[PDB]
Amino acid sequence: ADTIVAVELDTYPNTDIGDPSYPHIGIDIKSVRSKKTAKWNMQNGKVGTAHIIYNSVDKRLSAVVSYPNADSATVSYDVDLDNVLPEWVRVGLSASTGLYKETNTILSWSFTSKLKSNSTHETNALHFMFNQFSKDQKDLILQGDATTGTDGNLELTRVSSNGSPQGSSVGRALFYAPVHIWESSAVVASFEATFTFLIKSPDSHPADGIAFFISNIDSSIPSGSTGRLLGLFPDAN
Amino acid sequence: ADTIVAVELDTYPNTDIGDPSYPHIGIDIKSVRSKKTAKWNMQNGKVGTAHIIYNSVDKRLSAVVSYPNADSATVSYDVDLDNVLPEWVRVGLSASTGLYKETNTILSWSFTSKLKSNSTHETNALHFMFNQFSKDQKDLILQGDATTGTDGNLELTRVSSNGSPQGSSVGRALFYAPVHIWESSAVVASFEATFTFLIKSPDSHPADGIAFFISNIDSSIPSGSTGRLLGLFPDAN
Amino acid sequence: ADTIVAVELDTYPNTDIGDPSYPHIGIDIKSVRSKKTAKWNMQNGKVGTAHIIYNSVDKRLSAVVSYPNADSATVSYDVDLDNVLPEWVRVGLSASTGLYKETNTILSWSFTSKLKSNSTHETNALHFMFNQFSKDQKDLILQGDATTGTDGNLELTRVSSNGSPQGSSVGRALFYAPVHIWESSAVVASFEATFTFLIKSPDSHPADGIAFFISNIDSSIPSGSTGRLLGLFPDAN
Amino acid sequence: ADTIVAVELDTYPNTDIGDPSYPHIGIDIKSVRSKKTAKWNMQNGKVGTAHIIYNSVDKRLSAVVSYPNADSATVSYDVDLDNVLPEWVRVGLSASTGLYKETNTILSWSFTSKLKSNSTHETNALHFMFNQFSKDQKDLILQGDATTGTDGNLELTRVSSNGSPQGSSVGRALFYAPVHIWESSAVVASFEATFTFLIKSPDSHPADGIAFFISNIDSSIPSGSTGRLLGLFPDAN
Numbered sequence A, B, C, D: 001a002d003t004i005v006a007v008e009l010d011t012y013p014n015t016d017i018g019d020p021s022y023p024h025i026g027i028d029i030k031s032v033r034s035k036k037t038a039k040w041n042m043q044n045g046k047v048g049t050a051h052i053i054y055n056s057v058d059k060r061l062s063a064v065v066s067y068p069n070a071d072s073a074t075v076s077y078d079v080d081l082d083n084v085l086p087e088w089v090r091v092g093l094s095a096s097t098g099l100y101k102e103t104n105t106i107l108s109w110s111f112t113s114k115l116k117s118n119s120t121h122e123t124n125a126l127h128f129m130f131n132q133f134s135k136d137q138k139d140l141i142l143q144g145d146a147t148t149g150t151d152g153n154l155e156l157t158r159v160s161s162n163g164s165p166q167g168s169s170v171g172r173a174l175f176y177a178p179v180h181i182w183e184s185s186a187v188v189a190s191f192e193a194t195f196t197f198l199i200k201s202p203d204s205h206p207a208d209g210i211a212f213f214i215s216n217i218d219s220s221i222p223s224g225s226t227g228r229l230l231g232l233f234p235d236a237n
């Protein structure tokens, strides 16, 4: 079972597995059962922005989801990630549908990672920025139902040629090169991630949501992770 | 009286205005009596590094000070800076000697500040980086005994023509352009500061220390703020 | 008499002082009579982008100006900027109007400058990024008829409350920190400027243009620099 | 047959395959026989810096190799890289030795790559920065005899425990993630590469040198490409 850390943009209350009774944003440390949640005020058919930050000094993982001309939703969590995560990781975006469904459109994705070591005090860094996605994007690893190059976007779950999101779909996109997310001889370690998304649904209810996640480098869609497990966890422990 | 927010490197305990028994780092909100400190084994003659960070999600001002191959010293304080600092500020570095003295050399200084708007979801940013200082650096404002150009460094307090530190000396360097440090309608504000330093003294007691600070744009050194007031404060309140 | 280097977006042919017969972009070294130009098919009412670049290796000033889904205009001139500009300078944007007029609206501006020094092989950098301009922009120096804050933009030339641009107007925005644009002992030096704009006009010929420029720190609008002079040159030599 | 673009730092003059009679830098478009060279006063045992730049507005590839307090050496070549390179590429460092030998040490490596597209005017970017290389650098592909970890440096070719260099050696380090180096529909595209090296010989003759290169993503060391072929080319046509 793969080590997962994720910030989930959960659009579907799964009350049987501990979801609060409203669309919410969550911090998931090795479980779909969030460690901290926050009411999120989703706008169907509106482009939204997500922003995740962590730094090894506060050892706190914050995320803020926001639409133009509306309030934030924030959710933070004290967590020492070098006790959770392997030293090297891949980071990625994940998304799923179930009985109910939604477009899981990714529009822009950026990410920054820094290690400021304790031996030499000289920093290592990684930075990537996707504002559009071509049809044959080679620094991305696509898993399951994800496809790029439709209107310059990254489409995480399926969309028909008639634009209608499909059900029982899971897709992920991972950045191709692994990231050095912590190291014992490091004074300060920090990362930032940002993406913009468009969730649109013809149903009265949209599901299930998008997640930003960090994981061991060889992670893949777990068996049966469609629907409420967001392509992230095999089960619901 | 200016509005100072500062992170002090205090190499001399003034136990009588409230410093602890050992040389320390601390966070100063509008008063030289640190709202929070931590002990800091200053290595005399030796190049150290200060990293300061703050972000509007956490509203936590944090700082790490470290030497190569030595445990670091860290200190953090939760403070809503937008109720303390004017909306625009200037950032700078400051130092002072009293009876006991030390060289207060700055070898490199860098700073990043960012504001993402909630109306437009677009970013304003400022970044500057000094890895060597020149004789007539026009983006710095030097106050008091601060000079630049000596071996390409920034000497905060005064040195002699025979490399000797001097007492009763005080000096400051401000980044010339003003800085937009919080905006009522921003979703996330964050800033980051880094400098390196060599403090050297022939004495057995070096004093007083070095501070990164943030102030109102028009700030000047207060009268007789040498010594234990670090060129920041008019008094010990 | 100021020293001006500029990249000009020239909406209005003034053939009697050397402009070509059509709208154009040009490099200007200490003269309004461009050393080099290209045909610019300016699009009334559309947002466009300009990208300017220079580096000490190749000592060549190049600009690209285009609109979405339109071909670009580029223009290039070999110039050793350190036999032209003072070692410290200020960067800015400028626009004028004359008998004919246009909106000279600035939606974004970013600038980046780097000095890798021969003595140490370590780098000084300045970077600033504007994506909205507040009503009180303290890191901008506003000159002439220039204003920030209306809809988050910088309006370089006078715009009435009804939104119509006026004739007989000149306006300049400069960044507040002077910029170390060259050093005799730097292995490599480079700078990069980008801005987005909106020239909308009611007149069947709009006038006069926008310009990015670099000048000595204290530069101010020359006398009678409206119209074809573009707020940069006192006369047309 | 791999496609190769390389800036080479050639320490051993092979006058039989077109090398000049003197240690030199050169620019290699698909051939070990440089398209353009420049005398380079190698400095045995000291740390040097190499800065490479290319942009699509000017289709000129440039490098500067210099030491602390010496004259730079620069070489440049007009070349439209998108007639020579596939759109996606991997970037890397290479070194080799023949009969005569040298330590081919890399102490730092940074690379920046930027793509602004014409359909949207919205930018994609990659940046990575190695100031120290660890025992298991997961974002690096090590080929031949390249190892990381010793002194925090990257050794492209075999060094014994003594520090003694080892003949008939070749090694390459490539960045893990593939890089979008051009795109037919981008307004402006550019990349930057920087690294610091130490070339220490016991012989009076060092050989053969270090190279920054860009190749097809699946590139591997050509057979028998030690010596003058630097790890890049199969034969010396």
Ligand SMILES: O=C(NCCOCCO[C@H]1O[C@H](CO)[C@@H](O)[C@H](O)[C@@H]1O)c1ccc2cc(C(=O)NCCOCCO[C@H]3O[C@H](CO)[C@@H](O)[C@H](O)[C@@H]3O)ccc2c1
Pocket: B012, B014, B097, B098, B099, B100, B101, B166, B167, B168, B207, B208, B226, B227, B228, B229
């Ligand atoms: O005791 C103090 N101050 C005492 C106050 O109570 C204790 C607080 O001590 C300090 O201790 C800490 C700093 O060390 C701080 O935490 C405190 O705030 C405080 O400032 C005190 C304060 C300032 C001083 C400044 C100098 C100075 O200008 N530096 C150069 C070295 O000495 C001067 C030589 O120049 C001339 O000097 C004399 C002229 O008169 C002649 O004899 C000499 O031949 C010569 O021509 C020297 C001694 C000082 C002593």
Ligand SMILES: O=C(NCCOCCO[C@H]1O[C@H](CO)[C@@H](O)[C@H](O)[C@@H]1O)c1ccc2cc(C(=O)NCCOCCO[C@H]3O[C@H](CO)[C@@H](O)[C@H](O)[C@@H]3O)ccc2c1
Pocket: C012, C013, C014, C015, C097, C098, C099, C100, C101, C205, C207, C208, C226, C227, C228, C229
């Ligand atoms: O049709 C066109 N558009 C171009 C398309 O090409 C058409 C080719 O054919 C033209 O010319 C042909 C032959 O001549 C005719 O047959 C055609 O019918 C047509 O007119 C066209 C475009 C530009 C023109 C510029 C002038 C011109 O003389 N320009 C400068 C004169 O001064 C104006 C006031 O000056 C004041 O205000 C200016 C503007 O605010 C400031 O800069 C000044 O500093 C000052 O404050 C005149 C006619 C133009 C006609």
Ligand SMILES: [Ca+2]
Pocket: A010, A011, A012, A013, A014, A019, A208, A228
């Ligand atoms: Ca759910």
Ligand SMILES: [Ca+2]
Pocket: B010, B011, B012, B013, B014, B019, B208, B228
């Ligand atoms: Ca003190």
Ligand SMILES: [Ca+2]
Pocket: C010, C011, C012, C013, C014, C019, C208, C228
């Ligand atoms: Ca004109």
Ligand SMILES: [Ca+2]
Pocket: D010, D011, D012, D013, D014, D019, D208, D228
């Ligand atoms: Ca050779």
Ligand SMILES: [Mn+2]
Pocket: A008, A010, A019, A020, A024, A026, A032, A034
């Ligand atoms: Mn949930």
Ligand SMILES: [Mn+2]
Pocket: B008, B010, B019, B024, B026, B032, B034
């Ligand atoms: Mn103190």
Ligand SMILES: [Mn+2]
Pocket: C008, C010, C019, C020, C024, C026, C032, C034
């Ligand atoms: Mn012109």
Ligand SMILES: [Mn+2]
Pocket: D008, D010, D019, D020, D024, D026, D032, D034
């Ligand atoms: Mn050669």
